[PDB]
Design a binder for these strands. Structure first.
Ligand SMILES: Nc1ccn([C@H]2C[C@H](O)[C@@H](COP(=O)(O)NP(=O)(O)OP(=O)(O)O)O2)c(=O)n1
Ligand SMILES: [Mg+2]
Ligand code: NA
Ligand code: NA
Length: 327
DNA sequence: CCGACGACGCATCAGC
DNA sequence: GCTGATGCGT
DNA sequence: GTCGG
């Protein structure tokens, strides 16, 4: 639909969601508020009453009353209060620093650290991740236009083919689905000499090559299969330098690759929905494998998979190309 | 009345 | 030193 | 907070 339909409500709910997550540490309330925010945002009518909203799946008694108060007044008493509160809003803001979750956020505020100024004053108290997350607080919230994503793909695909001819690299996420802008870069990676029954340097080599040509600039986390770091396009001539971007690189076994590709292509709203349909039909899908569900609920062995299409050729559905996986 | 609610890799932490 | 728990991002 | 056992 349109934002301004029930945008006031969805915003109200989203604000509520973030406070539950970051201040109350109630993750399931946070997901509840979001589920309501989503189902309402897709509801093609202007909500007249909280009772009208209650009819939707995921909207219950509490939110219904919250909508009554909002429609009748244009705001929420509890929300205006938590906004003006120094301690709760400070906690809520710090979690925007990647690396700082709700726990570390409350630690800082409890000992008097409430702002980025305070953080920068006390960098010794921060761990590695939090220093990077703070360093690029600005950049990490900027979006990435597809144009810059394509150039990034160019480098990633080239540097990967340069390390070993037989690597298979795929940029997934919203990029693959076609989104004109993206929040980060999701790279998926495999290699013929890595399977379920199979060097612990396959991911390392790729990462360090991307470091040598100065694409990857910082490291948040690196293991044998998963990489989280930062990357930056080379500056264009006169033009002012590019923002630093988040990049993830995952090394997946060859036989688990297309399940992984399917999963990290998304959207999560699409995934969450393919999983059930998969259920209905007697199949369970994760990021690793698709497995048949038996008489009881017993999982047999994972079926052979050689394409995304193969996976639809188990739940008897016809291909939906990444372009249309909006949800 | 009450439990589920998504689950996993990696970094640091609690503890032995 | 180690194992296991917790926090974190996603 | 919502849904459903
Ligand atoms: N909480 C989440 C969110 C997404 N995912 C999955 C499905 C996503 O499409 C895929 C990549 O995650 P992502 O980078 O956060 N989202 P996506 O690329 O689809 O959109 P952006 O915000 O990155 O532009 O992993 C997940 O496993 N757990
Ligand atoms: Mg992405
Ligand atoms: Na309802
Ligand atoms: Na954060």
């Amino acid at each position: 639909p349109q934002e301004t339909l029930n945008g006031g409500i969805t915003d109200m709910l989203t604000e509520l969601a973030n406070f539950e997550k970051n201040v109350s540490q109630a993750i399931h309330k946070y997901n509840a508020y979001r589920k309501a925010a989503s189902v309402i945002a897709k509801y093609p009518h202007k909500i007249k009453s909280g009772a009208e909203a209650k009819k939707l799946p995921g909207v219950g008694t509490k939110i219904a009353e919250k909508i009554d108060e909002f429609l009748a007044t244009g705001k929420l008493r509890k929300l205006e209060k938590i906004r003006q509160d120094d301690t709760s809003s400070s906690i809520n803001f710090l979690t925007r620093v990647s690396g700082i979750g709700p726990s570390a956020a409350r630690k800082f505020v409890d000992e008097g650290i409430k702002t980025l100024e305070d953080l920068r004053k006390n960098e010794d108290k921060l761990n590695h991740h939090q220093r990077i997350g703070l360093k690029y607080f600005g950049d990490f919230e900027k979006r990435i236009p597809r144009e810059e994503m394509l150039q990034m793909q160019d480098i990633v695909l080239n540097e990967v083919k340069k390390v070993d001819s037989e690597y298979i690299a795929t940029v997934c996420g919203s990029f693959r689905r076609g989104a004109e802008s993206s929040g980060d870069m999701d790279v998926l990676l495999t290699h013929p000499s890595f399977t379920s029954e199979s060097q612990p340097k396959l991911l390392h080599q790729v990462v360090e090559q991307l470091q040598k040509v100065h694409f990857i600039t910082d490291t948040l986390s690196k293991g044998e299969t998963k990489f989280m770091g930062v990357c930056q396009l080379p500056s264009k001539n006169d033009e002012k330098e590019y923002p630093h971007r988040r990049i993830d690189i995952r090394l997946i076994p060859k036989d688990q690759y297309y399940c992984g590709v399917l999963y990290f292509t998304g959207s999560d709203i699409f995934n969450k929905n393919m999983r059930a349909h998969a259920l209905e039909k007697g199949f369970t899908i994760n990021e690793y494998t698709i497995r048949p569900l038996g008489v009881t609920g017993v999982a047999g062995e994972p079926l052979p998979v050689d394409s995304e299409k193969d996976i639809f050729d188990y739940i008897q559905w016809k291909y939906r190309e990444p372009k249309d996986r909006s949800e």
